[PDB]
Design a protein around this ligand. Structure first.
Ligand SMILES: *[C@@H]1O[C@H](CO)[C@@H](O)[C@H](O)[C@H]1NC(C)=O
Ligand SMILES: *[C@@H]1O[C@H](CO)[C@@H](O)[C@H](O)[C@H]1NC(C)=O
Ligand SMILES: *[C@@H]1O[C@H](CO)[C@@H](O)[C@H](O)[C@H]1NC(C)=O
Ligand SMILES: [Ca+2]
Ligand SMILES: [Ca+2]
Ligand SMILES: [Ca+2]
Ligand SMILES: [Ca+2]
Ligand SMILES: [Ca+2]
Ligand SMILES: [Ca+2]
Ligand SMILES: [Ca+2]
Ligand SMILES: [Ca+2]
Ligand SMILES: [Ca+2]
Lengths: 397, 183, 272, 16, 265, 132, 264, 265, 132
């Protein structure tokens, strides 16, 4: 993988630096690297493809080196350079495809797409130029095990889950008490609802709690916590648990009182915020505990008191909501985001070349079913394919 | 009897259950003169004496069983702690337990069958300054060794010094104690 | 069951339970003798059953139970069916009687008996009332003070009590909640029970065959609610009424819902 | 102290 | 300009509200009130019509755009109402003994019906859905119906002995009969005096406005007993003088014409 | 170009689209065949209809790749261009709309405007590499 | 970027930090009533939630301008920024969301509550003015979508509520001619800054420097100093953005970037 | 606090046995004995009730929680037994002439029935499963049944000549009828004096305890003649007096309340 | 990960599982359609039900291969560790539960606990290679 990232980076820096009129004083080292790479590749015969609709290609490198006599580069030099770089580019592209389309449970870190296993050999290690990018850097760190990190903006770590929980239900669904929540992407929108407004509850107060449990720990996360969850704040018709019948939900928003948000880590509390709204921080956490309360307003006006009667009809249901978004984060493992295209490149290649379902990834790489079970095999294969996909995007976006 | 042997001070998650059951007698440790700190029933009685001198509705037939409803329904949930070799073991009637070190706040597995052997005979302390707010404070309002030891010991001097330093992470806890002293 | 329920929003809507709830449930109409009299027929019940049989309700599922009058029905309504429909006429004299009938059948009550001669009872909350049934309940009440003495009334002179009910077959007395009252009642004819109102009875369905909606279920004069299973019709005959009922029975049963509390043949739960 | 008042009530229970 | 067809139409949300059609619709439309003989009797004046028209003139309606059309009684009006005016208003007196009649009148005028003929003697008719009803007009209708089984026999009646039939109407000037939907009925009517039509209920008529001059709202437009609605063009007033009623109507005519909307047909 | 590329049936959340010039969202409103009283009371069999049944769908594009240039929520080139023109009071030109309103600039993406937009965004990136 | 701007400042010149969704608005959720009552049955005013990069403002009239002249009611919201911005990219949409559903709000002094049943209309005669030193710099009249603001220290959002002169039966049944007013006409506006540039330093949704700093301080139990507030709450740190705070914040953010370039 | 649903339950085997509920349920519940008039006759004491209440006081039950409710005879008690308490005890005398009557009484009160009404005149009913029975009460019932064939004709009986029917009851106050399940039956009943209800048998009523004060155990609760079970709350006693019986009940009430369990419905 | 790997239908005795995180054992209780009198006397058609029909299953994992470290019935490393701790009276640490009770140590097999357990097991093996 190191040699593949090296090929990609030197080809990028060749397409960028090697241009007519430029000066050999600026590209001497790059030309030395390129010539060493040609010397290493020339004579070897690679083969790529043979899965799904991926065509089978046989690469045979017989190239010539680049002179060092000139000072300024002429078209007679840039043209040979481009004729070579296009070949190496399509070769690296087909290798990254053949590696994004293969999986394995045993030794997912270890190279697949046997051409790449060959490239991993010791006669090919003379091409390493710089392992700078975040992905290859964390790769080398995991190989030489150390405290790693991937920095994410709006990470897709919550699987799409829209669901409720009813602590007091009936067949008619006329006096309900419970909590609804939608956890999707990087956002959680929770809302505790009481159809009675806590006329019967001790002290006219009803508690609500929602415990999220991430599959991978996060650090240095910046979070935006606001009240009055929007999507659970208008009329709704929902079905029952067993889908037999339906019920109505006419919410009326009140403000969360005595709100407490606790970011824990394997039962250990790490961060806690009591009624702080807006931008907040969490330095290390695996579990989130959002707790809020619904307190009957003691001082009511006529119009509002007409909405919370002392009997069962209850045509307005008191609600208490909360939105929470994870704007940035840092994770020891790989995920998906709203910024980087690696996931999309992988899934597009798979959809295009008609890759059957494998033993590790589910069909179509649905991020819900791929984040609900983040077993080390899946994690390693995901890191591998995302890394090589970033490598491929460094050349062909 | 979990521990050395039968005491009747420890008579019974299973852990959380046992701890709540033991805390329903640590309330009696509180009103048996076997405490060291602000002794929550004391705060309850102070609220009582501050309310029944203001309330217009006070009468001879009326105060009886109001004193008792107060003593019974003031601060229903309340937590306690025990210190042993610079290791605090907490407990609460709400089924929550927290083990942690004094100097460096970091949790630990809660050692049951030792917490009981210790709370039985060693003095107990009250959770006015309970671990959650304590850690929030040690994070935001960085704290010194003596101040932290005195807050563990529940000293009214350092308590009032923070309350005059206007620390919202303690003002909120005290307001919660008031709102629990509601009747 | 105190345990919690859970669910989801991706699940799909299951098939229709209508056209099977008919097969595995029963329906019971409660009509007035005036209807049978206006009709002057004998096989109108079989006619309605053979009509119902098209809407799905099989032969041995529909039932018709006559009641001579609103008060006669109010006296110990023995509703025992899986679906109850009641047709009730409008009468400005029987307004309160047929509001109390509504308050009794629409809602589920937990009733404790009363011993007046030996004890003196009070009320606790806004839903603990005293319901008296029988041929003629003439109730009088005298509130008392902390030291068992009368307030604006004399504990001996029944003629000084406050007469809340004069010759009524069904009375639902709500008094001030917190004070002890002494009661004088015609125990030889009427029985009076201290009943707390539970959640609503979703098994019954009232139909005001006449004037505007006047039924005030909730005794507090602020709500004045109009529940789902409380319909209103204008009439000049009864055949048209029954045809309307049959043609729009699926809506009635969609507005009703089989009970949850328990099986019981009375209009109120009895737990001593 | 403020709990000692409860303990004192209990102590002087014999005067009831 | 494609008539008889319904095609998708588009719009937007950036546009700004146009000018007020009011103060021009008055000039480009016509109004037609329906008052009872009791009103003109209480008034006892010969120029009250021109007086109200001069008053309307201040509200915008010109002289020869407003019309008054008396009616002797509620049933005599219900019998073949011919409401052909670009804005119709009706003043309706409350009577406990006329509740169903003045609810059927409402359900007949407030709503637009598509009526087909009905040959009792020759055919046997049924209903299909909850909007196919049998509307019978005339001076005195006495309707009787016998439902039938699969094999064209009787159910609680005999198809030859008319006395065995079930009496749903008895000397009524207007009936709107809904029966069970999915069975055949054999009918007997006094067709010399009353005409009965099989009418389907379409969307409502937004061109007529009913005003109940008396008691509480009782009008149950919907044959289904569950809804018991109360639309925007079913108003209510309390009254002691018809001059006061007419002055109210004139002073709040604009709200009425806003609650009403011209026909689409 | 009318041919199908990706199809998602009853999937919600994060998804991928490898190549597409056209989005087609097709959904249905299916009346609940089982209904409680509270909800049945809202959908009657006649015209009043004081509750209107709705079915919605949100669809955001978090990340993407394009063979042409556009604007984003992360890059400043367009703001730089517009601000330069606003500051130095440039007369309206034969190509770009007045004020350079992105709505009417993408509503007509003629290749001339595409080329000019590429050019100005390029030199704006260049100028922002020196003076941000 | 950070060290370049640092060296620039030291050798004083024109600096700039480029931001994506900057957190320049401190969390402020609050209302303002220009006609009130103890019963709270005929209210006119405006509400706003200014948080991070978004402003969700909503002007409400309970009487739908029935008594106002020309059936029009004005609304104006002024936001004064603590530090100038340049080349800002803004997305302005109508129909704000969090002030578009029923609500039960306590009053200012908190002695009573009131209900709020909104009904959304569109802003007409809308005018957004991005001003600098009180000088209007950019103006936008009924332009939605994606707009620009080249330099501004103040935002003035002005909009109107215009009673529909032509109403159908349904909608006319909502805006009667009397005081009850059981449906309250509203007009909302969402405005999110997506890209921006600033001579000073702030927080974003793209960089973790603030979280690095806060996490260091929370981990090592740092007592609160004279400059930064307790816990470094961005609200109370961007509410009074004094030059001392700006300088200390630039310094700690710069060294946080430095550290993050080694340990993540 | 969910009602009308059935949810899975969970538990463990490490939990400890909690303290006893006796001496708290004795206070927070109610007890109701049912005794025969023969006992009060043999006794001739107007204070035996307060005596037994003061004796229960020692066993834990307070004074105002116990009730004695007389009944003249097994049949007069079987007629509409309205049991509403928290723990019910019934004393029952042995009489071979009343074996089936006092077995029907047991099968009625011991079990919990889901009872719908019956319209003999119109409908012809049938039993679906082995637990749908027809129970009739009243002062004196006379039931006669006729099964039917596939084509709605009788089988050894005539739908007009009632006399041809088969007689299952003869002047009985309580009857429980189980017939062949799967054939339509027609009934003749003197409905003026008796009411018949179609009931389905559900799980047992754990609130009542029958005590046969006399001869051997004959009560066959279940109608199938294969089980003949003897349940926990089905007791037997030998007697020559009644004071001794009541002292036995008082001394072994805790065993009775341990053999009984409060209702589930 | 919710994907099935191995499935055995009506096979008893010795079986294999190549890779698995979840086990689902789904069985049925089928009333005997044909019953002798002796057994028919035990399943009556009424509620008492003095005999309760049961259906059981034993499943013993004899051998296995795990990417992580656990306890067995073959090796003494865990015993060595717990014995050393119980002998030299070590206070409970921030990672391992009190007494190193395997139940509460495997109920939450956090990566920290896994790493520390591997380390102490390794050094315990190293010590038992010298002093058993
Ligand atoms: C539910 O209805 C659909 C459509 O009529 C039908 O295909 C399906 O079989 C029904 N469900 C069952 C369980 O029969
Ligand atoms: C519409 O109203 C505006 C504002 O009152 C007015 O300027 C305009 O002239 C009106 N339109 C016409 C056609 O008069
Ligand atoms: C049950 O008995 C034990 C042992 O005497 C006692 O500790 C416990 O408190 C008792 N339970 C109750 C509820 O009093
Ligand atoms: Ca009455
Ligand atoms: Ca008096
Ligand atoms: Ca009361
Ligand atoms: Ca009529
Ligand atoms: Ca019909
Ligand atoms: Ca007939
Ligand atoms: Ca018998
Ligand atoms: Ca015979
Ligand atoms: Ca049978």
């Amino acid at each position: 993988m190191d040699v593949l990232y090296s090929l990609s980076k030197t080809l990028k820096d060749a397409r960028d630096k090697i241009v007519e009129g430029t000066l050999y004083s600026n590209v001497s080292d790059l030309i030395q690297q390129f010539n060493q790479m040609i010397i290493t590749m020339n004579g070897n015969e690679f083969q790529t493809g043979g899965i799904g609709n991926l065509p089978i290609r046989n690469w045979n490198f017989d190239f010539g080196l680049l002179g060092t006599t000139l000072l300024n580069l002429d078209a007679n030099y840039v043209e040979t350079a481009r004729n070579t770089i296009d070949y190496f580019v399509d070769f690296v592209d087909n290798v990254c495809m053949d590696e994004m389309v293969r999986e394995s449970q045993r030794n997912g870190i270890a190279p697949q797409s046997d051409s790449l296993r060959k490239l991993s050999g010791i006669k090919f290690k003379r091409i390493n130029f710089d392992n700078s990018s975040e992905y290859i850097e964390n790769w080398n760190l995991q190989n030489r095990r150390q405290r790693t990190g991937f920095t994410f903006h709006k990470p897709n770590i919550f699987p799409y889950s829209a669901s409720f929980t009813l602590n007091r239900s009936q067949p008619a669904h006329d006096n309900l008490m419970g909590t609804m929540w939608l956890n999707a992407g990087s956002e959680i929108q929770v809302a505790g609802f009481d159809y009675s407004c806590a006329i019967n509850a001790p002290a006219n107060i009803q508690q609500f709690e929602h415990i999220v449990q991430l599959r991978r720990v996060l650090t240095t996360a910046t979070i935006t916590l606001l009240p009055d969850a929007e999507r659970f704040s208008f009329p709704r018709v929902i079905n029952s648990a067993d889908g037999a019948t339906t019920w109505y939900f006419n919410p009326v928003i009140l403000r969360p009182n005595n709100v407490e948000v606790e970011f824990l880590l394997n039962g250990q509390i790490i961060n806690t915020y009591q009624a702080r709204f807006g931008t907040i921080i969490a330095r290390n956490f695996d579990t989130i505990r959002l707790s809020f309360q619904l307190m009957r307003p003691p001082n009511m006006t006529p119009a509002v008191a007409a909405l919370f009667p002392n009997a069962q009809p209850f045509e307005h249901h008191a609600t208490v909501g909360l939105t929470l978004r994870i704007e940035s984060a840092v994770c020891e493992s790989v995920l998906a985001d709203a910024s980087k295209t690696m996931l999309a490149n992988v899934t597009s290649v798979r959809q295009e070349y008609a890759i059957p379902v494998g033993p590790v990834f589910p069909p179509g790489m649905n991020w819900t079913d791929l984040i609900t079970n983040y077993s080390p095999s899946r994690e390693d294969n995901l890191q591998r394919v995302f890394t090589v996909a970033s490598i491929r995007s460094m050349l062909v976006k | 009897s979990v521990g050395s042997s039968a005491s009747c001070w420890t008579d019974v998650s299973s852990i959380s259950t046992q701890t709540s059951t033991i805390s329903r007698r640590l309330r009696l440790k509180e009103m048996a003169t076997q405490t060291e700190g602000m002794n929550f029933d004391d705060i309850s009685a102070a609220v009582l004496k501050t309310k029944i001198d203001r309330s217009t509705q006070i009468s001879p037939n009326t105060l009886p069983d109001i004193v008792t409803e107060a003593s019974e329904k003031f601060i229903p949930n309340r937590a306690y702690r025990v210190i042993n070799n610079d290791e605090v073991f907490e407990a609460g009637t709400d089924g929550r337990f927290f083990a942690y070190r004094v100097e460096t706040f970091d949790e630990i597995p809660f050692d049951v069958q030792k917490f009981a052997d210790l709370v039985t005979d060693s003095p107990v302390i009250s959770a006015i300054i309970d671990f959650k707010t304590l850690k929030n404070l040690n994070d935001n309002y960085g704290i010194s060794r003596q101040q932290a030891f005195n807050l563990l010991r529940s000293d009214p001097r350092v308590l009032r010094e923070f309350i005059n330093q206007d620390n919202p992470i303690i003002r909120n806890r005290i307001e919660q104690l008031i709102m629990q002293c509601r009747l | 069951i105190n345990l919690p329920i859970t669910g989801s929003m991706d699940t799909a809507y299951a098939n229709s339970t209508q056209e099977e709830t008919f097969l595995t449930s029963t329906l019971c109409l409660y009509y007035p003798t005036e209807a049978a009299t206006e009709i002057n027929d004998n096989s109108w019940k079989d006619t309605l059953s053979q009509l119902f049989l098209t809407k799905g309700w099989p032969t041995g599922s529909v039932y018709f139970k006559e009641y001579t009058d609103i008060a006669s029905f109010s006296v110990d309504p023995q509703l025992y069916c899986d679906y109850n429909v009641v047709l009730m006429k409008y009468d400005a004299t029987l307004q309160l009687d047929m509001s109390e009938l509504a308050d009794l059948i629409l809602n589920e009550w937990l009733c404790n008996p009363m011993d007046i001669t030996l004890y003196y009872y009070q009320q606790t909350d806004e839903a603990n009332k005293w319901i008296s049934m029988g041929s003629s309940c003439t109730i009088k009440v005298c509130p008392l003070n902390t030291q068992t003495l009368g307030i604006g009334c004399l504990t001996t002179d029944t003629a000084t009590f406050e007469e809340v009910a004069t010759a009524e077959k069904l009375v639902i007395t709500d008094v001030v909640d917190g004070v002890n009252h002494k009661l004088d009642v015609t125990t030889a004819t009427c029985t009076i029970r201290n009943c707390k109102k539970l959640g609503p009875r979703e098994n019954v369905a009232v139909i005001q065959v006449g004037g505007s909606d006047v039924l005030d279920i909730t005794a507090d004069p602020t709500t004045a609610p109009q529940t789902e299973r409380m319909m209103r019709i204008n009439w000049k005959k009864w055949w048209q009424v029954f045809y309307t009922v049959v043609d729009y029975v699926n809506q009635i049963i969609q507005a009703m819902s089989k009970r949850s509390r328990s099986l019981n043949s009375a209009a109120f739960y009895y737990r001593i | 102290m403020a709990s000692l008042i409860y303990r004192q009530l209990l102590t002087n229970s014999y005067t009831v």
